[PDB]
């Protein structure tokens, strides 16, 4: 599992894209077990 991001993107950014913008989204880290 990867841990609960919760508030990580709740910042008041100015732009159209928040800093952790992905494919709406995936954890970029390596999986320690099968998918």
């Amino acid at each position: 599992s990867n841990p609960m991001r919760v508030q990580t993107c709740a910042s008041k950014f100015r732009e159209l894209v928040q800093e952790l913008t992905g494919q709406d989204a995936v954890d970029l880290q390596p999986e320690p077990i099968y998918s």
């Binding site: 841990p3 609960m4 991001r5 919760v6 508030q7 990580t8 910042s11 008041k12 928040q18 992905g22």
Partner: protein
């Protein structure tokens, strides 16, 4: 120019779809989605002269995945 301002999307993981964003809101309605029991709820800013909206949903494939979609930007830093 590339279209984004209508559909400012923000993803997170959480044990529930109650989340903070530092702004103040009223809810104007709700619709159903596939694959999840919770409705999507829609909101509007309560700041004077602010025409910003959002909608908030859990995903189908997990209990733990949650997405907000905003429409327009708030020119105010105060909630």
């Amino acid at each position: 120019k590339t279209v984004r301002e209508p559909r400012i999307v923000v993803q997170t993981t959480s044990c529930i779809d109650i989340l903070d964003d530092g702004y103040r809101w009223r809810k104007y309605g709700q619709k159903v989605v596939c694959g999840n029991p919770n409705p999507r709820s829609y909101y509007k800013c309560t700041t004077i002269g602010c025409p910003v909206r959002k909608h908030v949903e859990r995903a189908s494939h997990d209990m733990r995945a949650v997405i907000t979609t905003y429409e327009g930007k708030h020119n105010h830093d105060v909630p």
